[PDB]
Amino acid sequence: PLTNDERQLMHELAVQVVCSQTGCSPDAAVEALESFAKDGTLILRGDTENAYLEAGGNVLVHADRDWLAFHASY
């Protein structure tokens, strides 16, 4: 399972993705992600190779699990 710090890092990467694709501000992107969370479609999951953050059935972020563990723990 993903740790709290790993989930936090995936959320920060998702905010970056939303800002990049929409030109919006980080606060705006956080609001949109929170809307997905309230609808129950903000899904964080992992397999032995990658972690994924999905919003509304679409993958916003995928990160190598070793890279994510390193950057979340150090």
Side-chain angles (χ1 to χ4, degrees):
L2 301 181
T3 73
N4 271 335
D5 288 329
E6 284 169 337
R7 296 180 202 267
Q8 197 167 274
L9 181 49
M10 292 290 290
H11 192 88
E12 299 174 16
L13 299 177
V15 173
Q16 294 180 227
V17 169
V18 177
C19 290
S20 175
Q21 290 191 343
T22 71
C24 70
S25 69
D27 291 11
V30 169
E31 211 177 63
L33 290 170
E34 175 69 10
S35 189
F36 286 117
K38 164 181 135 48
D39 207 305
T41 64
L42 186 63
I43 303 299
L44 266 164
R45 55 177 202 79
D47 55 50
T48 58
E49 266 90 9
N50 313 91
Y52 319 81
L53 186 152
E54 297 185 4
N58 317 312
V59 176
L60 280 181
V61 180
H62 63 87
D64 174 76
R65 288 283 304 259
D66 291 328
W67 179 95
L68 186 70
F70 181 77
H71 283 72
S73 59
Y74 293 91

